[PDB]
Amino acid sequence: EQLANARRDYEAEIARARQEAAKIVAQAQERAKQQEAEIIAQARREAERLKEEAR
C-alpha cells in the first residue's frame, strides 16, 4: 500500500520540489535585481563624480 500510494506521493513531492525551486528562483532574482540596482546607482554616482571633476 505504501508503494501504491507512494507513486502519487512522489509525484506530489516532485511538484512541491518544483514549487520550492520556483520560490528559490524568485528569491535569487530579487537579490540579483537588488545587486543590479546597486551597480546602476554606483555607476550613476561615478558619472556624477566624473562630471564634477571635469567641471
Partner: protein, 51 residues
C-alpha cells in the same frame, strides 16, 4: 481382532480419510503460494517506489 471384513472396512475408511486430507492439504498449498506471491509483490513494489 482378526477379520478380513474388518480389515477391508478399515482400509476403505482410511482411503476416504486420505481423500479428505488430500483436499485439506491442497487448500494449504494454495494459501502458502498466495502468501509468498503477496510478499514478493510487496518487496518489488517497495523497491520500485524507492527508486
Amino acid at each position: 481382532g482378526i477379520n478380513p471384513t474388518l480389515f477391508i472396512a478399515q482400509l476403505i475408511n482410511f482411503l476416504l480419510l486420505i481423500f479428505i486430507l488430500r483436499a485439506l492439504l491442497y487448500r494449504p498449498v494454495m494459501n502458502l503460494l498466495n502468501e509468498r506471491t503477496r510478499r514478493i509483490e510487496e518487496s518489488v513494489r517497495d523497491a520500485e517506489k524507492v527508486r
